[PDB]
Amino acid sequence: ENLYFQSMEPSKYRLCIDILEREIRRNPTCSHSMPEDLQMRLLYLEKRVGLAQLFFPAEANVAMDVANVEGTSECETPYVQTKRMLTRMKALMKTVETGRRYFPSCYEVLDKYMDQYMD
């Protein structure tokens, strides 16, 4: 269906997200480092971004729109299957980096929460 928005809200939001995405390609302290093991890094990112949506739905969904998470699938030829996981990991990571940059007070809450899994 096609709807007429005289205030162009959907389109204004798309321009904002694009300004946020661009403003980081160009141009809050954390308590731990993410796992170096790539499988564990993926699992860590899935848990953290999933918690961001539960604790901070609007902030999370802004960061995920900046990161383009909506294309990706949660965790055919193996080349493209693994590229899917890599693409998912890149977007989860960009979500976290966007939260760190624009929602620092959310990031510090999620940083203390994820520290409990780190040791």
Ligand X SMILES: O=C(O)c1ccccc1O
**Nearer CB in complex with ligand X: 8/28:** 28
Using CB under 6 A, count the residues that bind ligand X: 15
On the 0-12 / 13-18 / 19+ scale of CB atoms within 10 A, 44 is buried
Give break positions in the chain: residue before each, C–N beyond 2.5 Å.
Answer: 27, 75
- Token pair belonging to 22: 């661009």
Q: What share of the chain is helix, strand, coil (3-state, %, to 5)?
A: 70, 0, 30
| List 49, 66, 69, 91, residue binding ligand X (CB under 6 A) | 49
Q: Which of 69, 93, 94, 99 binds ligand X (CB under 6 A)?
A: 99
What distance in Å separates the CA atoms of residue 83 and residue 75, rounded to the nearest whole number?
A: 12
- 48 annotated as ligand-binding: yes
Contact positions with ligand X (CB under 6 A) in 59-78: 59-60, 63
Candidate ranges 4-12, 34-42, 49-57, 74-82; the one touching ligand X (CB under 6 A): 49-57
Q: Which residues bind ligand X (CB under 6 A)?
A: 48-49, 52, 56, 59-60, 63, 95-96, 99-100, 103, 106-107, 110
